[PDB]
Amino acid sequence: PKSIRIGPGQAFYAX
Amino acid sequence: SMVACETLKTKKMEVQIKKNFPSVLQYTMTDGKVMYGQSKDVRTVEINGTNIELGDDDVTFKKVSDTEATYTLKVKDEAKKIDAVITVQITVKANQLHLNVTKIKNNLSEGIPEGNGVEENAIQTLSFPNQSLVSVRSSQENAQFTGARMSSNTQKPGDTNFAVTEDTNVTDSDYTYGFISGAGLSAGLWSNSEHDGTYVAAPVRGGSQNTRVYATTQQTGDATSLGLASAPWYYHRTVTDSKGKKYTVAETALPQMAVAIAGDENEDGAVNWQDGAIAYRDIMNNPYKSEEVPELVAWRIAMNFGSQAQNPFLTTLDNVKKVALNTDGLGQSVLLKGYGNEGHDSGHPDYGDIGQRLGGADDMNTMMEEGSKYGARFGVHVNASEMYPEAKAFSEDMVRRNSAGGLSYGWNWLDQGVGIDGIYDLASGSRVSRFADLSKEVGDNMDFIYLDVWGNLTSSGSEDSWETRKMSKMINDNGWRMTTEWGSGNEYDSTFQHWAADLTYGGYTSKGENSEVMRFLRNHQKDSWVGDYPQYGGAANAPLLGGYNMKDFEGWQGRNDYAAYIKNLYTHDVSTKFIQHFKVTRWVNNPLLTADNGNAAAVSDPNTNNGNEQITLKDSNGNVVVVSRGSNDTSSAAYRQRTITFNGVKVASGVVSAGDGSATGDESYLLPWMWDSFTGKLVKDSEQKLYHWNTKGGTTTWTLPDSWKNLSSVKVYQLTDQGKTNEQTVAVSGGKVTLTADAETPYVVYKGEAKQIQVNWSEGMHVVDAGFNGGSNTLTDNWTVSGSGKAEVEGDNNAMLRLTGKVDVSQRLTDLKAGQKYALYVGVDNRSTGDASVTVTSGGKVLATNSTGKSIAKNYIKAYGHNTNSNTENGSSYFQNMYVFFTAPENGDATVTLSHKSTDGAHTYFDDVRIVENQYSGITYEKDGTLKSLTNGFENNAQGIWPFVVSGSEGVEDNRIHLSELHAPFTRAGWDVKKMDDVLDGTWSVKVNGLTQKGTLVYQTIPQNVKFEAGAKYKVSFDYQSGSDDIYAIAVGQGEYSAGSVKLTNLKKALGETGKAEFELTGGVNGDSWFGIYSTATAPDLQGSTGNAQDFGGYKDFVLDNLKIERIESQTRTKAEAQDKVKEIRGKYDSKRAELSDAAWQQYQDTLVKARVLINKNGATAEDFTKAYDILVALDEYMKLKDLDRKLLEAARAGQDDEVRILMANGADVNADDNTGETPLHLAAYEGHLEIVEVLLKTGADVNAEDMMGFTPLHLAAAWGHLEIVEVLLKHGADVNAQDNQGVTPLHLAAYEGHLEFVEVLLKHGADVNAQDCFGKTPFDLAIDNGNEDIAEVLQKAAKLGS
Ligand SMILES: [Mn+2]
Ligand SMILES: [Mn+2]
Ligand SMILES: [Mn+2]
Ligand SMILES: [Mn+2]
């Protein structure tokens, strides 16, 4: 459900 | 003598007719019942829309006999330019009265001038307004009318049923069918009228709107009389083509109409339209060859497309034999889609051009002749609305033009389609001559024509019933049964509609004929109804009569699932076809008909089936079928329950599995199949059989038919793709049998022991069982297996030959023409590192041989049986054709061997051994047996784009790549808006249509087609045409295609002028080198073209011809030079281990080890040292470019603006990517280097490049706050609505961050505010969840703008 900052190899959603 | 009436008589009735007009006064049946005709003095004749009333002096009468009278009508109107003499014949037979116009004389014309020229004062239309041939009155007991109009909508019935009362008031109310009943009699009116009128629902024209009956009321004393008349007939119709040219065309037939008077025909104690409908079958037109429709159990499409020859005619014959075994010989109807020219949607409208790569007319005739012995009928897909420049029929007169004089463009796919001028094609005699070309090829062997798209207004704005009648006539005249695309189309002559039979297409508004009247009349004559597809509701919710449910397994829309095809046949089609062997006699309690939808007088019998729907059907031998619905309430589980009885015995019961594939049912049946699969005659009492199906599986008990009641046992066989298996003897007790069945498994029941259907696999194919359809036994009876390894027939769908270890599979070749040239090709998928081979021998000596190592190219041919969506092994398929070319030996002794060499555990798959006459002789070998040269002008390709194979630029598709064909001037640059030649040399070339901006491989050679020896040097050259600069590139690779591991060389524009490309290639160490054509990320230059001209111009196309591959001499090296080259390479790259990918270091080590093997081998020669040196030079060039790519990405991330400029100038790939798939543009946008972004975009970087997360540079720019980078990207064509792998768009990221400017620019360029990510969240939803209420309201205002 947590939204993180996008970047290389890092998707917007992690749950 | 002066008596104003006469009497015509039969044994069934007497009819009084008027002498002053072809009118009936009344019909009196033997039993004394009376039906009225035209009781009033009505003498109207309509010609060309003008009503003329006839006087006593305008009509002459002659009674020919007791059954016939003749009238001569003088029809004149000087002011309206009408001066005609109409001859009318009235005849009677049994309970029928016929009224025919036998002669039309025009006093104002000499006839139609030569070549269908305009006939001045032509009699175009004729009718008898309010003729009232039959009538009913409001004063008669149970006076009623039933009418039918066309409906393709499952929720909208086409019928009307009402009482005729004093208030009934109609004037030329038009219907496809009309029936009147009153005072114990019923009659329908038949006419051959081509009139188009009122319809309920139809998505197209094409004969959907044919209404032939006119109903009119008049006052007859104190009562209202409802009379039936024919709708107008066309005689000498004047028409206009797309260029304004006028023509007069003669009648399809002379005007005809009839009535048939019925009493209580079905003996149910009521007289209504159903009684009239039974008598009506004796007078109605019957579609040509409609008598064979109940035999057509197995319909399907066998597809060919884009020069590939996915389904050669002799392969289709084997598939017919597979279906025959699995259905125990039930009739089949195979639609050949792509039988002609290069395949489906190639060569339209050259009907006579039989696909040469499929085996031509000769194989098509063998397939049809041999197939008919299994009850298989064949037909071809034709198009009379769209054509391609390649078609020999393509001409300026054939071209449909618009009001402005421009081309009426069709669809662009392989080539640009052009609309056909339909009026010109008919009136000039062009279309009928192309059908005659086809008739010359097929003789009397072909069963039907399938006419695509007709009615969609592609050929003209009309395609009316008159054009459709003429179209169907020219088809039926050649002995061909008529079939068409649209559900509602061609009511008069079609026996099948693809959009009625394939229930998945178009939705609930565009299916088959939703009419109780039409289906009652013609269910047994057509596959044009509504079958079970419960998501459509209404007519599609478990129709009692079933209805054809068509599936396919031979490539149509990628369909290849053989087991699902057979399962579907037994689920819906066997019972549907069983029901079609009987004619409807009674139909009550229809839940679709209500007072609300205009059917208050529809029959509601509470004494039949508890007031629920029931249909009774009968054949000519007095057999009775009763079909009953469990409940008329759609909310009840019993709505879908159906019982079928045969002579009062239950033969089927339960719920069918939903036709839409959404719910398995419980239906079981034991259907007596009493008919042969030819003309449908009864089989000898001893050969009678029953088909058994049990949806859920289990045990059921049945009462056998009357002729089986005294048997003590029956023989039961399970049906498979091998035929009858697992024979069981089942006891009969008191005329009953108990059967145990597996779920959805077909069984056939005989009175005694039944013989196997005889099958000789691959007749005319020069080998027995070329497709491995003979089961395990084929490897013993047909093919010979030898070796320590294993050979097996594998795969439950399309069976293949599977090899493991050291094994040879061989068979002698038959029927070869001594001294003639042949290509032998076989589908091969090799998962082993060891070689898989095809060899042709003659007395132990090798005539030709070919091999493949591990297969490197996945199959992307949608219509092909072993494409990569079909799972040959491990979720993929690498099937590709492997060729040998040889001359049939004088001794007539030749053998094919399929083999696997290595002793490893990996598999090799083979399928479809094809031996074909072929003149290709462009391969030259070295003494070694290795390649000396390969030349190809593509003039003799057995199939496909050999030595190339289609790649994955469109995934599994009907690939927009094929062999283009010459037809000057239409295929050449300069015709209309065309700027490219389709063909460069001779008659054929390789054409790529519109595959720009794919950033991937379009097509490539593979080692089984052209093998490049490790270290050997080759000069490759070809002629080409390319629509724009750098849209296509030459790709050179090793092994399975990898983005980044290919050398690319951009090709410059060569538009309408042939360019030349040439390069050198050094064979890679693994012998897996190849070259091909790659689609770059570069946008084409459309040169200001708009609309269809963008596709027809050729700006996006690539044509290749005159391929030449030749082994060349390389500078000779000593062992010392090769050893020094090893030291130089090692000195350059050994220190770069940490800076390299694990796969990149292994490839480097692999190449070095292999180069050293060449150098250090005992007995190595100058050729080995030269190869070793050349491998190392190629390795150097490769490692060099990978380092420049790695440095371009590093300079982009760190922000070294000038370093980026020199690296790109030195050769670095602007579209290279790192570990996570970031291009230098992704890295420049992410870190915020506006200049680097601008420079990379100028160079030619993919603006919409995606990394591993699906992020485009815009996603990274918007999410990190780089405003100008966003604007620059958008200007260059960055997709504003690009969604990452979680459905997140730049607007979502912009809303989640918090700046209005991002939101505004994105929205201005077209950002979807209603974009939902994978969690269903919109950018607004992400804004409110982080405390960004400001942006949330701006987003809310933006969403409310388009509310
Ligand atoms: Mn009746
Ligand atoms: Mn096969
Ligand atoms: Mn050529
Ligand atoms: Mn073409």
Numbering used by the authors:
A (entry chain B): 1 to 15
B (entry chain A): 338 to 1684
The authors write:
Here, we show how peptide and protein targets can be reproducibly crystallised as “guests” in a host crystal under predefined conditions, and we explain the advantages and current limitations of the host lattice-display method. In order to apply this approach to biological macromolecules, we engineered a host lattice comprising auxiliary- and target-binding domains; Fig. 1B outlines the design strategy. The auxiliary domain defines the robust host lattice by providing the majority of crystal contacts, and thus also the crystallisation conditions. It serves as a scaffold for rigidly positioning the target-binding domain to immobilise guest molecules at well-defined positions.
EngBF-DARPin construct L1 has a shorter shared helix, but the molecular packing only permits binding of small targets. To test if a single disulfide bridge stabilises the DARPin and allows target binding, we introduced mutations Lys1655 → Cys and Ser342* → Cys (*refers to a symmetry-related molecule) between the DARPin C-cap and the N-terminus of a symmetry-related EngBF domain. Using these mutations, DARPins B6 and G10 were fused to EngBF using the L1 construct. These DARPins bind a cyclic peptide of 15 amino acids cyclised by a D-Pro-L-Pro unit (c-pep1). Complexes EngBF-L1-DARPin_B6:c-pep1 and EngBF-L1-DARPin_G10:c-pep1 co-crystallised under identical conditions as the native EngBF and diffracted to 2.7 Å and 2.0 Å resolution, respectively. The Cys1655-Cys342* disulfide bridge confers sufficient rigidity to identify the DARPin domain. The narrow space in the L1 construct causes an additional crystal contact between c-pep1 and the host lattice. This minor contact does not prevent crystallisation and may add additional stability to the design.
